[PDB]
Amino acid sequence: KWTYFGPDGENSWSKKYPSCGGLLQSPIDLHSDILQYDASLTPLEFQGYNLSANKQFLLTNNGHSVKLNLPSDMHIQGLQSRYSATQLHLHWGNPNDPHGSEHTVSGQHFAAELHIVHYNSDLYPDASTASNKSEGLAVLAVLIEMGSFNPSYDKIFSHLQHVKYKGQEAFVPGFNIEELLPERTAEYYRYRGSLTTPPCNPTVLWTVFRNPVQISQEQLLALETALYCTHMDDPSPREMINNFRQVQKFDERLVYTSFSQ
Amino acid sequence: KWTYFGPDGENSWSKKYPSCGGLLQSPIDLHSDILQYDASLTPLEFQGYNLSANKQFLLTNNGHSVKLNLPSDMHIQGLQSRYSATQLHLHWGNPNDPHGSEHTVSGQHFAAELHIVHYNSDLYPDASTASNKSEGLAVLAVLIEMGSFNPSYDKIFSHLQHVKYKGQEAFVPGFNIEELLPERTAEYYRYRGSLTTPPCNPTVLWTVFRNPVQISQEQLLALETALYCTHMDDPSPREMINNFRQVQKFDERLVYTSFSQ
Numbered sequence A, B: 001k002w003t004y005f006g007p008d009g010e011n012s013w014s015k016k017y018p019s020c021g022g023l024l025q026s027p028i029d030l031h032s033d034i035l036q037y038d039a040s041l042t043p044l045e046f047q048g049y050n051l052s053a054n055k056q057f058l059l060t061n062n063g064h065s066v067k068l069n070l071p072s073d074m075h076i077q078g079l080q081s082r083y084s085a086t087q088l089h090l091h092w093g094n095p096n097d098p099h100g101s102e103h104t105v106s107g108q109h110f111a112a113e114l115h116i117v118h119y120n121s122d123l124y125p126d127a128s129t130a131s132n133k134s135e136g137l138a139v140l141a142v143l144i145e146m147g148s149f150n151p152s153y154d155k156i157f158s159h160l161q162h163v164k165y166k167g168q169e170a171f172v173p174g175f176n177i178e179e180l181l182p183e184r185t186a187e188y189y190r191y192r193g194s195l196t197t198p199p200c201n202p203t204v205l206w207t208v209f210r211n212p213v214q215i216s217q218e219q220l221l222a223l224e225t226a227l228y229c230t231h232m233d234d235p236s237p238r239e240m241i242n243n244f245r246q247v248q249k250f251d252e253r254l255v256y257t258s259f260s261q
C-alpha cells in the first residue's frame, strides 16, 4: 500500500506504521550545528565483500526499490557486535530532477543513495528478527553524485530491464561490493536512527560516508526509467521514481563524525 | 492534540487532519531549478498596515506560536480579490540550532520566519469560514536572519514576557506592520500551497519575500527562549522551540518569481 507520492505517501505512513511517527527517525540533514567529532569512531573493515563472480545473487524489485540479496558471510568488523550483510538497495529521484538522496548534507541532496543493510548476527538468527531490536541493524550509506560512469554500479544497473516490475527477480554474478564504497571510508558520520521506509523501526546504527561516489547521467537515467512499483499486469502502472523520504526533525540527537574537519 | 515533536508531531498530523497528507502542502524548498520569472507578478500594496497607536491588538501564546490579532481593515491590494488581515505569528528553531524558518532557499533555513495571514474578504465573511475554501487565504512570509537590532520587531518582542505560557494574552499598541517587511518587497516568490500547521488546508496563496530582515542575536535568543507550549501550572513544562514544519515534496511544479535578476 504505502508509496512515496499521493494519498499513501510519507505524511500518511504513520496511520498504518506507528513507528514512522515516533522518535529517532531517518534520514536527516547532516549540517554543522548538529555534528560533533568523536575520536572513538575508528575505521570499519569490510569482510567478505568480494563476492565470487562465479556465484549469483538475487536481485528483486520489491515494489519500493531494487534490492540485491547479500550473503551472511559478508560482514562489517569494527562495531561492538559483528553485523552481517542482508541486502543492498538504492533511492533516487527522476529523469527531470536527479536529486533523490535520502540524507542531505548542509541542505543539499545528492543524485541518489545506496544503503547496505546489515544485522547483528551475534544476537539474532536473521535480519527480520534483528529489525525490531535496539541497534539490531547497521546500514552503510553511500551518497551518489552525477559524474563519471561507474562500472561497479553498472554490475547492478545492467540488470534493471529484468526486474522492471514488482515481484520480479534476476541473478547478478558476484562482484566486489567494496567497489561501491567511496574514497576514505575512514571518514563518516554516525548516528542512531531508523529504517527510512515503513515500518520505520528506530533500530538502525547509521554510517554515512563523508565522500560521495559518482555514476553517470546515463546510469541515473537508466535507474530512473527502468522500474515500476506495480506488478507487470497492473492496469494502473506507477513508475518507481522519487523513492526517498524527506529529512526528519533531529529530536535532539547529534551526529558524530570520525573526521574533525 | 498536535505538536512539533514526540508522537503527536508532524508525521502524525494526517491522523486527525487528513489534508496534512494531501496535495499542495507547504512549506517547500525554494531552489533555483524550480523558479520561473513571471512578469505578471507586480508589487503588492499594503493598505491599513499603519495600525492606530490609539488601538490595542491581542497577543496570544496559543501553545504553537505567538500570535498577534490584526484588524480586517488592514489588507493586501494587488491580488485577484482583496485579502484582509487576520493575524501574524512566527516560527523559529532553538539556540543550539538557530535555523527554524519553514521555507528554505537553496536548501538553507533562515533563523526564523514571520507569517502575516490574510483571508479573501471579497468571497468570504471571515477568516475561519475562508480557511477551508477555494482562494481562501493569502500569507506574506518574511525570512529572518540574525544581524542588526530591529526596533520594529521589538514592538512585538518586548511583550513576550507577558505571554510566556499557553493561554496567556497581552495587548500590543498599534504600530506600522509594514515595518516588519523587508527591503524591496517588489521581489518575491509566489506559489499555491497550504497552511503549514493543522488542518493543513490547501487554500493558501503564498508570497515569500526574496530579501530577509535582521534581528539581533539577543532578539533571536529572546524569541527562542521566552515561551513555553504548556500552560503555566503544567507540572511537566515544555519550551516552545522548533515550531516549524519540515519541507514538503514539490514535483512537477514551479515557484514563480517577480524578479529575474
Ligand SMILES: NS(=O)(=O)c1cc(C(=O)NCCO)c(NC2CCCCC2)cc1Cl
Pocket (backbone or CB within 6 Å): A062, A064, A065, A086, A087, A089, A115, A117, A127, A128, A131, A137, A139, A194, A195, A196, A197, A198, A204
Ligand atoms: N532504507 S533503509 O533504512 O536502509 C531500510 C530499508 C529496508 C527495506 O527493504 N525497505 C522496504 C522498501 O524497500 C529494510 N528492510 C529490512 C526488512 C527486514 C529484514 C532487514 C531489511 C531495512 C532498512 Cl535499514
Ligand SMILES: NS(=O)(=O)c1cc(C(=O)NCCO)c(NC2CCCCC2)cc1Cl
Pocket (backbone or CB within 6 Å): B062, B064, B065, B086, B089, B115, B117, B127, B128, B131, B137, B139, B194, B195, B196, B197, B198, B204
Ligand atoms: N503557518 S501558516 O500556514 O501561515 C498558518 C497558520 C495558522 C495557525 O494559526 N496555526 C496555528 C498554530 O499556530 C493559520 N490559522 C488560521 C485558522 C483559521 C482562521 C485563519 C487563520 C493559518 C495559516 Cl495560513
Ligand SMILES: [Zn+2]
Pocket (backbone or CB within 6 Å): A089, A090, A091, A115, A196
Ligand atoms: Zn534505504
Ligand SMILES: [Zn+2]
Pocket (backbone or CB within 6 Å): B089, B090, B091, B115, B196
Ligand atoms: Zn505560519
